[model samples]
Target: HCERLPYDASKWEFPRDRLNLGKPLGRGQVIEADAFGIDKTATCRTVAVKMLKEGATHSEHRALMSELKILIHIGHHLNVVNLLGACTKPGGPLMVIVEFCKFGNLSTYLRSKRNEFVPYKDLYKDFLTLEHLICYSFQVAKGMEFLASRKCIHRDLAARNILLSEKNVVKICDFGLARDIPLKWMAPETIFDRVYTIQSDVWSFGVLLWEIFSLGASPYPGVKIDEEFCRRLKEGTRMRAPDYTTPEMYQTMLDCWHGEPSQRPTFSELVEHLGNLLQANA
Candidate 1:
């Protein structure tokens, strides 16, 4: 039942003394920490600790707890940011420790690889290829499938929320209700009526595909987020194919933007399609 989540509180509770917090990251209050006791190998594991302010309000506390609950429910998917440990005991600072992604967020990663002289023409000059982009898309879809299987919806599924491990493995991150509403990434139903569902997440995934294909280009160029934009969206307007996107891949993006939410392909179907695409491109 939703009232009581099935989670072992003891398994997640990490002693404050065991966490060796290091320098704070450029983003938020997150810091690099060597979390001990997380693994059986007895080696201190590298993790990112998201710390709450010293005097955090109840609102913030609840938001962090909601994130933890989501991670607990979704459990361990290779494509999703896995929870290592957390420190939530009273009288101590609240913290959430997750596996540290070496390459940071995928948005920054994509933009960094873009050609500075030529915008979208030679994105692969830095050793990236179309196969890599399709692989990333497939990985994200696999992660989304796991979330959907758990009946969980990552309301904000964007390149910015995705992380890249050392081996370039994509891991979805920042699962919580505390973040601001990403209207640009939302579906018509979610933006207009505050309705969030797995289908809405599918819509965001389409936008994410655009981001990947365009080498981290922002969605809806030259369009402001306003009443007119919402009207156009409801009237069947959608983003055009990115310059680098193949027609076949663009078709997948279009499928994700169907007006009827039920018409949008499920994550499992996406996984299958993207996997096949990756194999062909490989």
Candidate 2:
């Protein structure tokens, strides 16, 4: 029911002068609208909007909106980002309004030099250490486990999709590509292309773990391009792991990206594995 507007950024207006008009959110090419009084004020009340691509097909539009609806229906949790509202106003184009994360996406935070050296003493001291990564990873896995229990597959579970509050709570975002998994991570049989499954989502989570470890570096260097990775995976060739990752983390990622898919660990198992990592450090 939504139509695309022209590419002109001037065509759009801030809903309530909340968001700071700035550059796009990331390399995905999504234009970020003003937070409309929702940048960092009310953690649960703030809202941010993302302008969808123009000339998107009706099916594509439906998928986008449907995903938003599904996320909202799932309700709020510590791991899943809350969906405050949405805007599909005629002149404004299709916009998905989601909770404004004070810390922004995990990728953005890790890329910043400050985060690399930010003393854990500045904030919750104990909460900011690398140990928190394990805690947050477990929390994310809990969120995915909850979704899996409900027969909903996150499809895309990455650091980029996981948001954080000012107080350091992790909130999973972006349900646009989420769907039900028939055989865990293995691609579905109904669609010729790679389909969303529980295993596939775990595969994404493994990449996310790598992202968290490397401080948000891209999945692979030059061998697998952006969109080409998925295309190649669907054609029976999957993306390979980088050479410099830790042996433990690399092994985890390798398991997730297994061609058989059935060999990948479930989210529940993944949570246990990450928990084990934390224990080892202890």
Candidate 3:
């Protein structure tokens, strides 16, 4: 069953030959600290370490080995963050080493510097260009395309869950957990609302797109993200595209939220759509 995967003792070990701890990156669900890992050959590089919190009672913890074990089987998706290494030393907290994305989460980055989109040459740059937005949408779609091909549904897909590497390299991060999602992203009894299915992820993808163009605005601003929102959503009232979004992008958003779940486009289709947009805008 998918309930458990094979656990190999050989997998869990010191992430590197030596670790040099440094200052912390903003922490929330996981305490992420900056560090350097010195490999067996004495080469060292900057890395990020994420540790589970204390007093964890989630059943996933019992099979932490198995959970991480699955990650090892899948590796090296460029737009998806990677687990460089992990440590499950007995009597200690579960920890993992993942590549550090300089800009942290996309939502925070967008809000803190919405107008600071261009990567460099700031002396002449003050706003996000269409190309900048195109890159963000395309890269994320590529990442989701990877997950879709693998039959993976990222139950939670939002700006906050997407990490931004230096130079605006965006990647999908923290593929969701029970405690990470808010009610707004959850599926409901409505015919068009569902979760766990690939179609459900398309719904979240639409929300994520809105977040990107809205400059990190919540899925619904001012109003409660409760049944009322869902009611309006199921009734065909979707979030209007931001002022800056192109008509093509807005159309893509609408397509993602099609009334029938079966009518939703797959991530592959999303990638294709976004990819064409990138070229057209280029």
Candidate 4:
């Protein structure tokens, strides 16, 4: 896992396709484009386009191409956003087309639905019911379980990377950032030395669970993410459970954030755990 891996250009190389620009659906804090696909006959298909930014070097492109490779290999799954295709050209911007998410990203959806903010307070906000939280968490676990068989890591797993369909079906997206990874959700080694693994993803998954249960609240309440916090995290401090989190659920989350990567349960374990929790709640 320490070694660099690139995509098999032959199987995953997608043909060029036309895409028409659309108004940004979510916050464009990144290089993603919410454009719809256009065919020769001018038929339009809603799609999300991810483009490698300008001045991106060879290594960066390789990392993105590796991500596309995984997406292509995984094929279709109910919980994963479909990768329609890609628009490719040498030495220029590379854009990958994905099935459009109607309600945008999960973080956006959660925040919009949440009317009040008791900032840094882990009150039982009820933005997401127990069943709702368990269901979404189960779907994410299912998606990660599928990815488990693919032999790679989703270094970035967060609410912002998950999208919701018209029926509120959750679709995991944003493979683009998996390469760089998000520090706030990272395991200690990953945050310190960039060592990423599926177990590390389990750690991020725990943080995501925290965000979901809290209706998108930050994991560490009132703590600035800096060297001091990172040091404290490595030294064994962990975040408090959200007030609404059941003790059993919070225990499961804590298992994921174990300091040792080998100690964290696999995604399959997470799938079973969440499913059981959902059934119990139901």
Best by lDDT: 1
Q: Rate the local accuracy (lDDT) of all candidates.
A: 0.84, 0.62, 0.70, 0.73
Candidate 2 regions with alpha-carbon error over 4 angstroms:
1-45, 50-65, 85-97, 114-129, 181-193, 224-247
Q: Residue 267 error for model 4, in Å?
A: 0.8
2 against 4, candidate with superior lDDT? 4
On residues 126-161, what C-alpha lDDT tens digit does candidate 4 reach at each position?
A: 445667777888999888877767665777899988
Model 4 regions more than 4 Å off? 1-19, 25-44, 51-67, 89-94, 115-127, 177-181
* Model 2 TM: 0.64
lDDT of each residue in 40-132, candidate 3, tens digit only: 355566677766556677664654544455455555688988767676767566766677787788888878766665522236546666777
**Backbone clash total, candidate 4:** 0
Cα error, candidate 3, residue 257 (Å): 0.8
What are the per-residue Cα lDDT tens digits for candidate 1 across 1-282? 331454466888888998898978764278988877786568888899888766789877776776776677778999998998788878588788899998988888888876632322324354677877888999999998888888777888999999999776999987774121278899999988889889999999999999998889999998999999999999999999996787889999999999999999999999999999888876
lDDT of 3: 0.70
**Candidate 3 Cα outliers beyond 4 Å, as residue runs:** 1-3, 7-12, 15-17, 26-42, 56-60, 91-93, 117-123, 176-181, 186-194
Q: List the residue pairs that clash in candidate 1.
A: none
Can you give the TM-score per candidate against the true fold?
A: 0.90, 0.64, 0.83, 0.76
